[PDB]
Design an enzyme around this catalytic site. Structure first.
Site, PDB file in Angstrom:
ATOM      1  N   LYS A  67      -7.823  -0.136   5.356  1.00  0.00           N
ATOM      2  CA  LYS A  67      -6.796  -1.075   4.861  1.00  0.00           C
ATOM      3  C   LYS A  67      -5.606  -1.093   5.782  1.00  0.00           C
ATOM      4  O   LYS A  67      -5.136  -0.042   6.193  1.00  0.00           O
ATOM      5  CB  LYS A  67      -6.304  -0.629   3.473  1.00  0.00           C
ATOM      6  N   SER A 142      -4.665  -4.649  -4.375  1.00  0.00           N
ATOM      7  CA  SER A 142      -4.311  -5.072  -3.010  1.00  0.00           C
ATOM      8  C   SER A 142      -5.290  -4.691  -1.883  1.00  0.00           C
ATOM      9  O   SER A 142      -5.133  -5.182  -0.762  1.00  0.00           O
ATOM     10  CB  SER A 142      -2.900  -4.558  -2.631  1.00  0.00           C
ATOM     11  N   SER A 166      -5.076  -0.482  -7.141  1.00  0.00           N
ATOM     12  CA  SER A 166      -5.404  -1.302  -5.956  1.00  0.00           C
ATOM     13  C   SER A 166      -6.615  -0.835  -5.120  1.00  0.00           C
ATOM     14  O   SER A 166      -7.000  -1.535  -4.166  1.00  0.00           O
ATOM     15  CB  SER A 166      -4.164  -1.442  -5.050  1.00  0.00           C
TER      16      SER A 166
END
Lengths: 452, 452
Positions: A67, A142, A166
């Site tokens: 990420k 996210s 997330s």
């Protein structure tokens, strides 16, 4: 088997059984799969330069996505923000150092909501990521880029970050495993994060065992993160031992919200499967659990804030109102942070009371399956997407999302929440669900086959 | 007497006793006084063109200031915003039509917090207004320009607007009378306002009787404001009749906050004066009154929202956080508006219970005297300035601030709150306080003499 029959389907454990010749092709084949699929999925912000594969570490050659709020050598870290479009850390996050020392190859950086502030990845400064099961739909967030990349098979596994869901929620929406460990097990050194008491980095994987394997790798004390504990947790050893004779709790609160019917149906089937495997399932009442979301939204943002045309009347009024709201919110945090922390302790106490009598708490990971990109504009609706995931962050508890069939042709996730440092048991329960699920083939949930 | 001995000291009632020759000089003398004093006080955004005085209406020639969120013919209405710096309504607010029909002369438009969003006037787009008693200090707000202009004697009287205290509080801090009528008595047609259930326009004056006189003028049904009632209220008839045999309530909540010592001392003296005049004073407990401020800050803003250098990382992060906070606040309003309205009804019910057994509720208008310009940067502190004034807006009740001596050489205000449509009684109680105050000379509170 020694041959890579379909790169998209590969797990970490299958990679280990490949012949050296087939294994050394993985990082290049990942890049090629990204080139083919990513124009449709849009999971990646950046990909690495294809380079010689080192054969160092047990997990050498195995391609993974990170990420893009996690700092990495070699590639930029944008946090999906325009301002960091060309930012280079020249420094690996502790979890990335660990992964690379174990042999994993970081082939790219995955898309996210800008600065990880969202629940659908649509707030990326660059572009929305699209769900491999339906490209009109969100992958959650996210950590949407990370979940979509694993689901689509562009990589073998990925890391995300989880403040209020997330990691778990995008995994749920994409039909993959998402794990959030006990608070204190994984360093945040190198995470660009705005909430110190709530965040863990966690793995996103194709199988429950693959997530336990990554936990074994990324966990551990780090002098650069004082929140990391010295206590060692075993994630993998007991993973196959099943749930016979266990006792599980289901919060009454789940039933006091109108959730997607197919999600409810899948969740009830998981409960029945658990009883067939020799566990008992009971509803429990957790008095203050209904205050979780409100409590979270005081603490997490409080933390964030502490880390020629005859035109323009509308813009000025909106500006003034926005600046006004900001100052008023600051007042609110000042008036109410301490109270929110008290309510957080209370919720945490009650959850620990439940977890003294039950092996785990079970919930749906999400109240809904993946919604359409551009569909959710209602603020309250949007901020309720993490309703079931938030409590684990408030209480610092281990929690996993594991796929359990579909609703509206989209993956549904079931969440297992354990007591602090009972990560091994959480993995054990999740594995029993995956192994015995009537929606898996040979203990494996289907993976979507995006058209090139 | 027939001669204007000192324009600064003139009341509406004294103006009526002037000879025609002395009376026709008032609008020009107001402009001259503004020219002399306003460079120091900064009360005005604009002043009118000096023109022939019409001798029409009982109150002909008497100069007044109008807060610059109230629309006026002839002069611009800026709402103390840069975007409206050159805006002309070409239209009088209903309260301005009324004033002018009665004969009053609008000589200027008074400074305010931009769009009336504040409690100190410091948020004017143009400049802060300064307290005539100490030019280093705030005049309160949002009607600070109006209060400062009256106090300094630049005009005979003024109109402001009051959503949560914005007439009463600046009057308190400047040592003048500020009145907020029962909800429904004064048209908001021509008020540039963001909160329909809370706002009234009200007068700011040098005496209690002058405020009753303006209430008689500006009140009344207006087809352009459907919230205006048909019920006629008499503000003036009983004003002299005193408080012997009355019963007054003091909320216990006043004593559960650390307020400025001199403010407490002045307030206790007012209570003692009332007992000397033959009233009884009792503490009461109002169970939900402590929720007033929180309730107000859900409703009022909810209503508002429903009406080349290697630089920039900080700005983008602040932007994202600010936009994020705005969307989250929208969610909060959605989740909590109805509950805030329930709590508002409850507070209102409890206040009506008190006001069924007592003639009025008494409090300090403000917990503090005027603070320094630039002194208050703490958000929570700032938003607590209206602690004692907010409840009258929540419950739609008449409330007046009347000067009662000084603390730290600055004026202190005492507030009288009555039941709905008991405006006449509120005025009667306030007048008894002013008439008998040991800090007034001949029933009149001192007015500061700003040095030219």
């Amino acid at each position: 088997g020694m041959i890579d029959l379909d790169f998209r389907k590969l797990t970490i454990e299958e990679c280990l059984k490949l012949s050296e010749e087939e294994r050394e092709k993985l990082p290049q084949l990942s890049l090629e799969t990204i080139k083919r699929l990513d124009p449709h999925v849009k999971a990646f912000i950046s990909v690495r330069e294809n380079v010689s594969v080192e054969k160092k570490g047990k997990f050498w050659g195995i391609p993974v996505a990170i990420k893009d709020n996690i700092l990495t050598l070699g590639m930029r870290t944008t946090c999906a923000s325009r301002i960091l479009e060309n930012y280079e850390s020249v420094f690996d996050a502790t979890v990335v150092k660990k992964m690379k020392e174990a042999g994993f190859v970081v082939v790219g950086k995955a898309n996210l909501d800008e600065f990880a502030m969202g629940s659908s990845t649509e707030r990326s400064a660059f572009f929305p990521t699209r769900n491999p099961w339906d490209l009109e739909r969100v992958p959650g967030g996210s950590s949407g880029g990370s979940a979509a990349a694993v689901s689509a098979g562009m990589v073998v596994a990925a890391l995300g970050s989880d403040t209020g869901g997330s990691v778990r929620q995008p995994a749920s929406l994409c039909g993959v495993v998402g794990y959030k460990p006990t608070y204190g097990l994984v360093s945040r050194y190198g995470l660009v994060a705005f909430a110190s008491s709530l965040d863990q980095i966690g793995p996103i994987t194709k199988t429950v065992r693959d997530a336990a394997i990554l936990m074994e790798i990324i966990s551990g004390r780090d002098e650069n993160d004082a929140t990391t504990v010295n206590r060692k947790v075993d994630f993998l050893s007991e993973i196959e031992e099943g749930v016979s004779g266990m006792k599980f709790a289901v919060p009454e609160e789940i039933y006091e919200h109108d959730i997607e019917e197919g999600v409810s149906e899948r969740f009830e089937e998981a409960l029945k499967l658990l009883e067939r495997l020799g566990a008992k399932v009971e509803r429990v009442k957790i008095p203050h659990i209904k205050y979780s979301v409100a409590t979270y939204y005081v603490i997490a943002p409080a933390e964030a804030s502490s880390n020629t045309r005859n035109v323009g009347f509308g813009e000025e009024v909106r500006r003034r109102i926005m600046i006004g709201t900001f100052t008023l919110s600051a007042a609110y945090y000042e008036a109410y942070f301490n109270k929110a922390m008290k309510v957080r302790r209370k919720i945490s106490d009650e959850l620990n009371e439940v977890l003294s009598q039950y092996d785990a708490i079970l919930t749906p990971t999400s109240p809904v399956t993946a919604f359409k990109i551009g569909e959710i504009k209602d603020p309250l609706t949007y901020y309720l997407m993490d309703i079931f995931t938030i409590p684990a962050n408030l209480a610092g508890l281990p929690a996993i999302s594991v796929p359990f069939g579909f609703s509206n042709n989209l993956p549904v996730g079931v969440q297992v929440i354990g007591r602090r440092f009972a990560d091994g048991k959480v993995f054990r329960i999740a594995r029993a669900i995956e192994k015995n699920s009537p929606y898996n083939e040979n203990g494996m949930f289907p993976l979507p086959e995006v058209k090139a």
